[PDB]
Enzyme design. Structure first.
Site, PDB file in Angstrom:
ATOM      1  N   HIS A 219       1.040  -1.294  -0.036  1.00 56.79           N
ATOM      2  CA  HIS A 219      -0.131  -0.147   0.167  1.00 56.79           C
ATOM      3  C   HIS A 219       1.053   1.223   0.079  1.00 56.79           C
ATOM      4  O   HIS A 219       1.006   1.984   0.928  1.00 56.79           O
ATOM      5  CB  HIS A 219      -0.739   0.027   1.220  1.00 56.79           C
ATOM      6  CG  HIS A 219      -1.962  -0.946   1.222  1.00 56.79           C
ATOM      7  ND1 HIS A 219      -2.556  -1.626   2.287  1.00 56.79           N
ATOM      8  CD2 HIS A 219      -2.873  -1.581   0.133  1.00 56.79           C
ATOM      9  CE1 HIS A 219      -3.486  -2.550   1.877  1.00 56.79           C
ATOM     10  NE2 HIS A 219      -3.492  -2.300   0.546  1.00 56.79           N
TER      11      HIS A 219
ATOM     12  N   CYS B  69       3.093 -12.251   2.798  1.00 62.39           N
ATOM     13  CA  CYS B  69       4.415 -12.087   3.608  1.00 62.39           C
ATOM     14  C   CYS B  69       4.347 -13.571   4.461  1.00 62.39           C
ATOM     15  O   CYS B  69       3.286 -13.608   4.860  1.00 62.39           O
ATOM     16  CB  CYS B  69       4.225 -10.772   4.529  1.00 62.39           C
ATOM     17  SG  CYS B  69       5.635 -10.990   6.012  1.00 62.39           S
TER      18      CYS B  69
ATOM     19  N   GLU C  18      -5.842  -7.799   4.113  1.00 63.39           N
ATOM     20  CA  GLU C  18      -5.406  -8.688   4.837  1.00 63.39           C
ATOM     21  C   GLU C  18      -6.374  -9.555   5.609  1.00 63.39           C
ATOM     22  O   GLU C  18      -6.357 -10.763   5.751  1.00 63.39           O
ATOM     23  CB  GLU C  18      -4.268  -8.321   5.977  1.00 63.39           C
ATOM     24  CG  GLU C  18      -3.786  -9.676   6.725  1.00 63.39           C
ATOM     25  CD  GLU C  18      -2.665  -9.044   7.815  1.00 63.39           C
ATOM     26  OE1 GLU C  18      -2.753  -9.529   8.883  1.00 63.39           O
ATOM     27  OE2 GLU C  18      -2.140  -8.125   7.561  1.00 63.39           O
TER      28      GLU C  18
ATOM     29  N   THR D 173      -1.803  -8.351  11.311  1.00 61.55           N
ATOM     30  CA  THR D 173      -0.301  -8.083  11.499  1.00 61.55           C
ATOM     31  C   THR D 173      -0.107  -6.612  11.888  1.00 61.55           C
ATOM     32  O   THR D 173       0.967  -6.401  12.586  1.00 61.55           O
ATOM     33  CB  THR D 173       0.398  -8.720  10.401  1.00 61.55           C
ATOM     34  OG1 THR D 173       0.031  -7.916   9.363  1.00 61.55           O
ATOM     35  CG2 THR D 173       0.308 -10.384  10.214  1.00 61.55           C
TER      36      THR D 173
ATOM     37  N   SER E  34      -2.652   2.763   3.933  1.00 58.98           N
ATOM     38  CA  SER E  34      -1.665   1.875   4.549  1.00 58.98           C
ATOM     39  C   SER E  34      -2.009   1.558   6.183  1.00 58.98           C
ATOM     40  O   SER E  34      -1.835   2.630   6.855  1.00 58.98           O
ATOM     41  CB  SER E  34      -0.215   2.279   4.568  1.00 58.98           C
ATOM     42  OG  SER E  34       0.669   1.515   5.569  1.00 58.98           O
TER      43      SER E  34
ATOM     44  N   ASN F 189      -0.703  -0.105   8.785  1.00 59.02           N
ATOM     45  CA  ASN F 189       0.254   0.105   9.556  1.00 59.02           C
ATOM     46  C   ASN F 189       0.740   1.639   9.680  1.00 59.02           C
ATOM     47  O   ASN F 189       1.164   2.353  10.843  1.00 59.02           O
ATOM     48  CB  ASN F 189       1.488  -0.508   9.158  1.00 59.02           C
ATOM     49  CG  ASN F 189       2.533  -0.147   8.152  1.00 59.02           C
ATOM     50  OD1 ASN F 189       3.425   0.543   8.752  1.00 59.02           O
ATOM     51  ND2 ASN F 189       2.098  -0.719   6.957  1.00 59.02           N
TER      52      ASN F 189
ATOM     53  N   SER G  30       5.697  -0.040   4.524  1.00 56.60           N
ATOM     54  CA  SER G  30       5.764   0.159   2.862  1.00 56.60           C
ATOM     55  C   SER G  30       6.384   1.429   2.296  1.00 56.60           C
ATOM     56  O   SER G  30       6.315   1.479   0.748  1.00 56.60           O
ATOM     57  CB  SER G  30       4.114   0.120   2.291  1.00 56.60           C
ATOM     58  OG  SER G  30       3.398   0.886   3.119  1.00 56.60           O
TER      59      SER G  30
HETATM   60  C1  10E Z   1       1.736  -6.470   3.493  1.00 51.66           C
HETATM   61  C2  10E Z   1       1.380  -5.795   4.946  1.00 51.66           C
HETATM   62  C3  10E Z   1       1.957  -4.740   5.384  1.00 51.66           C
HETATM   63  C4  10E Z   1       3.010  -3.840   4.699  1.00 51.66           C
HETATM   64  O1  10E Z   1       2.357  -2.499   4.568  1.00 51.66           O
HETATM   65  P1  10E Z   1       1.375  -2.146   3.651  1.00 51.66           P
HETATM   66  O2  10E Z   1       1.358  -2.329   2.342  1.00 51.66           O
HETATM   67  O3  10E Z   1       1.199  -0.597   3.907  1.00 51.66           O
HETATM   68  O4  10E Z   1       0.035  -2.611   4.374  1.00 51.66           O
HETATM   69  P2  10E Z   1      -1.044  -2.706   5.563  1.00 51.66           P
HETATM   70  O5  10E Z   1      -2.358  -1.864   5.106  1.00 51.66           O
HETATM   71  O6  10E Z   1      -0.214  -1.821   6.791  1.00 51.66           O
HETATM   72  O7  10E Z   1      -1.458  -4.090   5.668  1.00 51.66           O
HETATM   73  C5  10E Z   1       0.335  -6.558   5.766  1.00 51.66           C
HETATM   74  N1  10E Z   1       1.179  -7.412   6.667  1.00 51.66           N
HETATM   75  S1  SF4 Z   2       4.166  -5.272   8.137  1.00 51.04           S
HETATM   76 FE1  SF4 Z   2       4.568  -7.364   9.045  1.00 51.04          FE
HETATM   77  S2  SF4 Z   2       3.361  -9.177   8.399  1.00 51.04           S
HETATM   78 FE2  SF4 Z   2       3.151  -7.177   6.799  1.00 51.04          FE
HETATM   79  S3  SF4 Z   2       4.561  -7.497   5.281  1.00 51.04           S
HETATM   80 FE3  SF4 Z   2       5.805  -6.385   6.737  1.00 51.04          FE
HETATM   81  S4  SF4 Z   2       6.939  -8.142   7.933  1.00 51.04           S
HETATM   82 FE4  SF4 Z   2       5.124  -8.913   7.011  1.00 51.04          FE
END
Ligand code: 10E
Ligand code: SF4
EC number: 1.17.7.4
Length: 309
Positions: A41, A96, A126, A167, A225, A227, A269
């Site tokens: 993301h 992942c 997810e 996660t 995103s 996280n 990300s």
């Molecule tokens: C792939 C993933 C996290 C990596 O960050 P992201 O692509 O921003 O995704 P999320 O929206 O935080 O799940 C879920 N473990």
């Molecule tokens: S935020 Fe965590 S679970 Fe998600 S891709 Fe990264 S290491 Fe994997």
């Protein structure tokens, strides 16, 4: 104005692998490479892969016969996997490994006909993938987001019940949900803590240390995103102004006018170049050399499948 950088920040092991899978599949097979959902993301990463030949789709019926298809890092349901299996497609999986670990537990409870609870945010890919590992109508799979959702849930057999988590959740809010789960369902079984991964825990601890020093925190990440939004939310709840931004062009000068200490971090990300451009813009706005905070070492790497070396 002092600029502080959180540590750790930025790419985690799963993201670095997932991006390498798409880049290596483009270099080996050529364009187009189909990807189910944004690989990660991040708009900067997705836009550049799209320019290089990746095509991002949501539904397997958008993909033509004979194509290469990669599942995103967030994972997919078993129904999506089996739809790809039955179609005429070459599939690579960038899920992942720390998502896959959750999936295998949900699949085991399904086989047993025993109920599971996921803690996560409705609609996120997810969550769709992990709820999509459960398929036995005699059991059940329930989603809760908050303690209020726990206080409303009834299940069929609370003596045979387990839980799992997304996660990328808030470590603090997830503790509150688990404490509700265990009060309501005293025999529920889970991991020792939750399924929140090392990168999410470590980036949340790091933005907590950063917000203790900084008046304003800038989190580099995209709006979708999860996280990254957790990092901005943490700093906000500590009483600091915090902005989730894609890049340096998003920074409004009012946010940092007359501010003595600005903190910068990045979701799991977001590539490092975006942080280096944010720092350069804050320096235009009067900041000095960026000071990295001391942080927890990360040392985990996940390798690409050998088929994509
Ligand atoms: C792939 C993933 C996290 C990596 O960050 P992201 O692509 O921003 O995704 P999320 O929206 O935080 O799940 C879920 N473990
Ligand atoms: S935020 Fe965590 S679970 Fe998600 S891709 Fe990264 S290491 Fe994997």
């Amino acid at each position: 104005m002092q600029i502080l950088l959180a540590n750790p920040r930025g790419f985690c092991a799963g993201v670095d692998r997932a991006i390498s899978i798409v880049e290596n599949a483009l270099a080996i097979y050529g364009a187009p490479i189909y990807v189910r959902h944004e690989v990660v993301h991040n708009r900067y990463v997705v836009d550049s892969l799209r320019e290089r030949g990746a095509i991002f789709i949501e539904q397997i019926s958008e993909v033509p016969d004979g194509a290469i298809l990669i599942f995103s890092a967030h994972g997919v349901s078993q129904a999506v996997r089996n739809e790809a299996k039955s179609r005429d497609l070459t599939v690579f999986d960038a899920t992942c490994p720390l998502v896959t670990k959750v999936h295998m537990e949900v699949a085991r409870a399904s086989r047993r006909g025993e109920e599971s609870i996921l803690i996560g945010h409705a609609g996120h890919p997810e969550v769709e993938g992990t709820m999509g590992q459960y398929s036995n109508p005699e059991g059940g799979m329930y989603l809760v987001e908050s303690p209020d959702d726990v206080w409303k849930l009834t299940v069929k057999n609370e003596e045979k019940l387990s839980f799992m988590t997304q996660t990328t959740l808030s470590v603090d809010d997830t503790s509150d949900v688990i404490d509700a789960l265990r009060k309501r369902f005293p025999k529920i079984v889970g991991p020792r803590k939750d399924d929140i991964c090392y990168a999410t825990t470590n980036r949340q601890e790091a933005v907590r240390a950063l917000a203790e020093q900084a008046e304003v925190v800038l989190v580099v990440g995209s709006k979708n995103s999860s996280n990254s939004n957790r990092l901005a939310e943490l700093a906000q709840r500590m009483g600091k102004r915090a902005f989730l931004i894609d890049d340096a062009k998003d920074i409004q000068e009012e946010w940092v006018k007359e501010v003595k200490c600005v903190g910068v971090t990045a979701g799991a990300s977001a590539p490092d170049i975006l942080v280096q451009n944010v720092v350069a813009r804050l320096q235009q706005l009067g900041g000095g050399e960026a000071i990295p905070l001391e942080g927890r070492e990360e040392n985990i790497v996940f390798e690409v499948p050998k088929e994509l070396r």
